[PDB]
Amino acid sequence: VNSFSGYLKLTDNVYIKNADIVEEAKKVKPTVVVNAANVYLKHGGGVAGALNKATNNAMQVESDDYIATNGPLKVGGSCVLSGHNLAKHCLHVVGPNVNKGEDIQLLKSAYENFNQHEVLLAPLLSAGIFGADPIHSLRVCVDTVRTNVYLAVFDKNLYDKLVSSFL
Numbered sequence: 001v002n003s004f005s006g007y008l009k010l011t012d013n014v015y016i017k018n019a020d021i022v023e024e025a026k027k028v029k030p031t032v033v034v035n036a037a038n039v040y041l042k043h044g045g046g047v048a049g050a051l052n053k054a055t056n057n058a059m060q061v062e063s064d065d066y067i068a069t070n071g072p073l074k075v076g077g078s079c080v081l082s083g084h085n086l087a088k089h090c091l092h093v094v095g096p097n098v099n100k101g102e103d104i105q106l107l108k109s110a111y112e113n114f115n116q117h118e119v120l121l122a123p124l125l126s127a128g129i130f131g132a133d134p135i136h137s138l139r140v141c142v143d144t145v146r147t148n149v150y151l152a153v154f155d156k157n158l159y160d161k162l163v164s165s166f167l
C-alpha cells in the first residue's frame with residue numbers, strides 16, 4: 001500500500017491520472033520522481049522547467065555540478081540526483097526529442113531506467129515538447145516498465161484520450 005490517490009489502473013503495475021506532476025510530487029513526496037530531462041540537464045521548459053522552478057532552481061544548481069563532473073547523459077540514459085523539496089530522489093531520464101531528430105526507438109531504453117526503482121511518479125517520456133506521440137509513449141511504458149509506475153498527465157484532454165484509446 002502506498003499514498004498515491006485517484007489513479008486509474010491500466011495494468012498490474014501502471015496507474016494513470018490527470019494531474020500536475022509538480023503538485024502531485026509536493027503532496028505525495030514520493031521516493032522517486034522522474035524528470036523529463038535532456039542530456040545537458042538544462043531544465044528550461046516542459047516538465048523539467050516546471051520541476052526545477054518548484055525547487056527554487058536548486059535542481060538546476062545541482063545538475064550543473066553533475067554535468068561539470070560527468071559530462072552529458074546519453075539519450076535513453078538517466079542519473080539519480082536529489083529530489084529536493086519534491087521527493088527523496090529525482091530520476092532524470094532522457095527520452096528522445098523528436099523535434100531534434102532523435103531516434104524514437106530509444107524510448108524503450110529510456111523507460112528501462114524505471115525498472116531500477118520499485119515505485120516511481122513519472123510523466124510520459126518524450127511527450128509534450130519532446131514531440132513524440134503520447135499514445136505511443138504510454139504503450140512503450142506499459143510494455144517496458146515492470147516496477148510500479150504512477151503516471152501524471154497534466155492535460156485533461158490528453159488524459160481522456162489516453163484512457164479511452166488504451167488497449
Ligand SMILES: C[C@@H]1CCN(c2ncnc3[nH]ccc23)[C@H](CO)C1
Nearest residue numbers: 021047050123127128129152154155
Ligand atoms: C510530457 C509532455 C510535456 C509536459 N507534460 C507534463 N506532464 C505532467 N506534469 C507536468 N507538469 C508540467 C508539465 C507537465 C505534458 C502533459 O500535458 C506533456
